[PDB]
Design a protein around this motif. Structure first.
Motif, PDB file in Angstrom:
ATOM      1  N   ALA A   1       4.242  -4.120   9.283  1.00 46.78           N
ATOM      2  CA  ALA A   1       3.096  -4.202  10.167  1.00 46.78           C
ATOM      3  C   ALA A   1       3.297  -5.365  11.115  1.00 46.78           C
ATOM      4  CB  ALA A   1       1.861  -4.387   9.393  1.00 46.78           C
ATOM      5  N   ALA A   2       3.694  -6.493  10.593  1.00 50.42           N
ATOM      6  CA  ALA A   2       3.828  -7.639  11.460  1.00 50.42           C
ATOM      7  C   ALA A   2       4.925  -7.420  12.460  1.00 50.42           C
ATOM      8  CB  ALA A   2       4.127  -8.836  10.637  1.00 50.42           C
ATOM      9  N   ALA A   3       5.991  -6.831  12.025  1.00 47.31           N
ATOM     10  CA  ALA A   3       7.081  -6.596  12.976  1.00 47.31           C
ATOM     11  C   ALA A   3       6.619  -5.649  14.015  1.00 47.31           C
ATOM     12  CB  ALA A   3       8.260  -6.068  12.256  1.00 47.31           C
ATOM     13  N   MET A   4       5.975  -4.599  13.591  1.00 48.98           N
ATOM     14  CA  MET A   4       5.538  -3.631  14.579  1.00 48.98           C
ATOM     15  C   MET A   4       4.541  -4.265  15.506  1.00 48.98           C
ATOM     16  SD  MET A   4       5.182  -0.259  12.417  1.00 48.98           S
ATOM     17  CE  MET A   4       6.480   0.917  12.448  1.00 48.98           C
ATOM     18  N   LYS A   5       3.713  -5.109  14.953  1.00 43.45           N
ATOM     19  CA  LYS A   5       2.745  -5.741  15.831  1.00 43.45           C
ATOM     20  C   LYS A   5       3.465  -6.628  16.813  1.00 43.45           C
ATOM     21  CE  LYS A   5      -0.798  -9.019  15.444  1.00 43.45           C
ATOM     22  NZ  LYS A   5      -2.198  -9.384  15.149  1.00 43.45           N
ATOM     23  N   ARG A   6       4.495  -7.347  16.374  1.00 43.54           N
ATOM     24  CA  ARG A   6       5.208  -8.184  17.358  1.00 43.54           C
ATOM     25  C   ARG A   6       5.805  -7.357  18.428  1.00 43.54           C
ATOM     26  NH1 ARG A   6       6.375 -10.840  12.668  1.00 43.54           N
ATOM     27  NH2 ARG A   6       8.291  -9.628  12.268  1.00 43.54           N
TER      28      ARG A   6
ATOM     29  N   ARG B   1      -0.554   2.962  23.160  1.00 41.45           N
ATOM     30  CA  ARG B   1      -1.068   4.254  23.563  1.00 41.45           C
ATOM     31  C   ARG B   1      -2.154   4.680  22.610  1.00 41.45           C
ATOM     32  NH1 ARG B   1       1.829   7.173  26.845  1.00 41.45           N
ATOM     33  NH2 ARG B   1       0.092   8.670  26.654  1.00 41.45           N
ATOM     34  N   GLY B   2      -2.930   3.705  22.190  1.00 45.77           N
ATOM     35  CA  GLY B   2      -4.096   4.019  21.404  1.00 45.77           C
ATOM     36  C   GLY B   2      -3.855   4.290  19.963  1.00 45.77           C
ATOM     37  N   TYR B   3      -2.677   3.990  19.491  1.00 46.05           N
ATOM     38  CA  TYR B   3      -2.426   4.157  18.097  1.00 46.05           C
ATOM     39  C   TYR B   3      -2.372   2.815  17.448  1.00 46.05           C
ATOM     40  CZ  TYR B   3      -1.322   8.838  19.058  1.00 46.05           C
ATOM     41  OH  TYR B   3      -1.306  10.134  19.434  1.00 46.05           O
ATOM     42  N   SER B   4      -3.294   2.634  16.548  1.00 51.18           N
ATOM     43  CA  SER B   4      -3.390   1.375  15.893  1.00 51.18           C
ATOM     44  C   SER B   4      -2.176   1.129  15.047  1.00 51.18           C
ATOM     45  CB  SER B   4      -4.600   1.406  15.022  1.00 51.18           C
ATOM     46  OG  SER B   4      -4.411   2.337  13.983  1.00 51.18           O
ATOM     47  N   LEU B   5      -2.018  -0.103  14.758  1.00 54.03           N
ATOM     48  CA  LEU B   5      -0.885  -0.505  13.999  1.00 54.03           C
ATOM     49  C   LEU B   5      -0.740   0.273  12.720  1.00 54.03           C
ATOM     50  CD1 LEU B   5       1.359  -2.547  13.882  1.00 54.03           C
ATOM     51  CD2 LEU B   5      -0.249  -4.020  12.768  1.00 54.03           C
ATOM     52  N   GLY B   6      -1.807   0.482  12.027  1.00 56.47           N
ATOM     53  CA  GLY B   6      -1.716   1.200  10.775  1.00 56.47           C
ATOM     54  C   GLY B   6      -1.120   2.544  10.896  1.00 56.47           C
ATOM     55  N   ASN B   7      -1.406   3.155  12.002  1.00 55.61           N
ATOM     56  CA  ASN B   7      -0.753   4.441  12.218  1.00 55.61           C
ATOM     57  C   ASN B   7       0.740   4.336  12.204  1.00 55.61           C
ATOM     58  OD1 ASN B   7      -2.571   6.646  12.816  1.00 55.61           O
ATOM     59  ND2 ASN B   7      -3.464   5.024  14.039  1.00 55.61           N
ATOM     60  N   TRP B   8       1.235   3.325  12.847  1.00 54.56           N
ATOM     61  CA  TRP B   8       2.666   3.154  12.933  1.00 54.56           C
ATOM     62  C   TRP B   8       3.236   2.802  11.600  1.00 54.56           C
ATOM     63  CZ3 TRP B   8       4.554   4.906  17.164  1.00 54.56           C
ATOM     64  CH2 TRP B   8       3.735   4.929  18.284  1.00 54.56           C
ATOM     65  N   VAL B   9       2.511   1.958  10.891  1.00 52.87           N
ATOM     66  CA  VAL B   9       3.009   1.586   9.581  1.00 52.87           C
ATOM     67  C   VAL B   9       2.949   2.775   8.645  1.00 52.87           C
ATOM     68  CG1 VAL B   9       2.658   0.103   7.678  1.00 52.87           C
ATOM     69  CG2 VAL B   9       2.336  -0.737   9.975  1.00 52.87           C
ATOM     70  N   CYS B  10       1.871   3.503   8.734  1.00 52.83           N
ATOM     71  CA  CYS B  10       1.762   4.689   7.929  1.00 52.83           C
ATOM     72  C   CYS B  10       2.884   5.613   8.276  1.00 52.83           C
ATOM     73  CB  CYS B  10       0.416   5.286   8.208  1.00 52.83           C
ATOM     74  SG  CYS B  10       0.112   6.693   7.154  1.00 52.83           S
ATOM     75  N   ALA B  11       3.145   5.781   9.561  1.00 49.85           N
ATOM     76  CA  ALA B  11       4.158   6.736   9.928  1.00 49.85           C
ATOM     77  C   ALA B  11       5.440   6.297   9.276  1.00 49.85           C
ATOM     78  CB  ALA B  11       4.294   6.798  11.400  1.00 49.85           C
ATOM     79  N   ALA B  12       5.736   5.021   9.364  1.00 55.64           N
ATOM     80  CA  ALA B  12       6.962   4.544   8.783  1.00 55.64           C
ATOM     81  C   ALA B  12       6.943   4.814   7.276  1.00 55.64           C
ATOM     82  CB  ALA B  12       7.130   3.098   9.080  1.00 55.64           C
ATOM     83  N   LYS B  13       5.833   4.558   6.656  1.00 58.66           N
ATOM     84  CA  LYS B  13       5.755   4.727   5.217  1.00 58.66           C
ATOM     85  C   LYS B  13       6.147   6.132   4.830  1.00 58.66           C
ATOM     86  CE  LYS B  13       4.645   4.706   0.978  1.00 58.66           C
ATOM     87  NZ  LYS B  13       5.482   4.057  -0.030  1.00 58.66           N
ATOM     88  N   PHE B  14       5.604   7.073   5.552  1.00 60.61           N
ATOM     89  CA  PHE B  14       5.798   8.424   5.107  1.00 60.61           C
ATOM     90  C   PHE B  14       7.010   9.020   5.713  1.00 60.61           C
ATOM     91  CE2 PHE B  14       1.517   7.646   3.898  1.00 60.61           C
ATOM     92  CZ  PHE B  14       1.663   7.921   2.567  1.00 60.61           C
ATOM     93  N   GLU B  15       7.466   8.495   6.809  1.00 54.18           N
ATOM     94  CA  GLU B  15       8.703   8.976   7.375  1.00 54.18           C
ATOM     95  C   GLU B  15       9.852   8.504   6.543  1.00 54.18           C
ATOM     96  OE1 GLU B  15       9.365  11.117   9.316  1.00 54.18           O
ATOM     97  OE2 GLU B  15       7.543  11.424  10.458  1.00 54.18           O
ATOM     98  N   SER B  16       9.869   7.247   6.221  1.00 55.83           N
ATOM     99  CA  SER B  16      11.094   6.662   5.715  1.00 55.83           C
ATOM    100  C   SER B  16      10.833   5.858   4.497  1.00 55.83           C
ATOM    101  CB  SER B  16      11.671   5.748   6.736  1.00 55.83           C
ATOM    102  OG  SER B  16      10.831   4.661   6.944  1.00 55.83           O
TER     103      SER B  16
ATOM    104  N   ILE C   1      -2.241  -1.654   6.689  1.00 61.26           N
ATOM    105  CA  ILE C   1      -2.145  -3.040   7.184  1.00 61.26           C
ATOM    106  C   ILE C   1      -3.174  -3.902   6.513  1.00 61.26           C
ATOM    107  CG2 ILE C   1      -1.197  -2.364   9.336  1.00 61.26           C
ATOM    108  CD1 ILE C   1      -3.981  -3.237  10.506  1.00 61.26           C
ATOM    109  N   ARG C   2      -3.948  -3.304   5.650  1.00 61.25           N
ATOM    110  CA  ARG C   2      -5.020  -3.994   4.979  1.00 61.25           C
ATOM    111  C   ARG C   2      -4.401  -5.009   4.069  1.00 61.25           C
ATOM    112  NH1 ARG C   2      -8.100   0.332   3.309  1.00 61.25           N
ATOM    113  NH2 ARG C   2      -8.849   0.087   5.445  1.00 61.25           N
ATOM    114  N   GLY C   3      -4.959  -6.178   4.169  1.00 59.59           N
ATOM    115  CA  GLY C   3      -4.539  -7.201   3.251  1.00 59.59           C
ATOM    116  C   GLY C   3      -3.284  -7.845   3.711  1.00 59.59           C
ATOM    117  N   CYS C   4      -2.814  -7.541   4.917  1.00 61.36           N
ATOM    118  CA  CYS C   4      -1.629  -8.198   5.477  1.00 61.36           C
ATOM    119  C   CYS C   4      -1.881  -9.353   6.438  1.00 61.36           C
ATOM    120  CB  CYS C   4      -0.889  -7.219   6.340  1.00 61.36           C
ATOM    121  SG  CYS C   4      -0.383  -5.772   5.421  1.00 61.36           S
ATOM    122  N   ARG C   5      -0.889 -10.227   6.568  1.00 66.36           N
ATOM    123  CA  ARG C   5      -0.826 -11.302   7.587  1.00 66.36           C
ATOM    124  C   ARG C   5      -0.128 -10.732   8.826  1.00 66.36           C
ATOM    125  NH1 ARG C   5       1.036 -16.542   3.949  1.00 66.36           N
ATOM    126  NH2 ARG C   5      -0.986 -16.756   2.904  1.00 66.36           N
ATOM    127  N   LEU C   6      -0.866 -10.500   9.908  1.00 67.01           N
ATOM    128  CA  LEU C   6      -0.325  -9.769  11.078  1.00 67.01           C
ATOM    129  C   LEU C   6       0.221 -10.780  12.096  1.00 67.01           C
ATOM    130  CD1 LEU C   6      -3.452  -7.465  11.428  1.00 67.01           C
ATOM    131  CD2 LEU C   6      -1.304  -6.807  10.318  1.00 67.01           C
TER     132      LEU C   6
END
Length: 129
Positions: A9-14, A21-36, A124-129
């Motif tokens: 999450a932090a990396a993606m946020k950086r 494009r309107g996709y919150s960070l969690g979406n990206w992290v989630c995508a990563a989680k389930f993609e890879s 991203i809940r409970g993370c240091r962003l």
């Protein structure tokens, strides 16, 4: 590298993915989680001659060149191996390009299937962003 969710999450946020494009960070992290499963080395070599590469399992037909995929468009203008880097930049850049190329995050089937409609902020809940 297998990221932790918060680290990713932090990396993606950086890299500016939060609300890219309107996709919150969690979406990206989630995508990563389930993609890879957060594995930067993830590959899924498909039967269709393409492979999905990296933490976001970006596919080699349109997005990156792995030299072996028919119909390569290499829209991210990168070798797919760049998507297997431990740093996520290339994956992020390509992910951004995927969205910039008129995709939503539905471009990622694992996002569509496992993140869409979910509490993606959990990732991203409970993370240091």
């Amino acid at each position: 590298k297998v990221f932790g969710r918060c680290e990713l999450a932090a990396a993606m946020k950086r890299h500016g993915l939060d609300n890219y494009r309107g996709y919150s960070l969690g979406n990206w992290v989630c995508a990563a989680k389930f993609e890879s499963n957060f594995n930067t080395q993830a590959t899924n070599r498909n039967t269709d001659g393409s492979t999905d590469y990296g933490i976001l399992q970006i596919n080699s037909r349109w997005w990156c060149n792995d030299g072996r995929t028919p119909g390569s468009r290499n829209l991210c203008n990168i070798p797919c191996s760049a998507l297997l880097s431990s740093d996520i930049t290339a994956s992020v850049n390509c992910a951004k390009k995927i969205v910039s190329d008129g995709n939503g995050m539905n471009a990622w089937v694992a996002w569509r299937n496992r993140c869409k409609g979910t509490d993606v902020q959990a990732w991203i809940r409970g993370c240091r962003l």
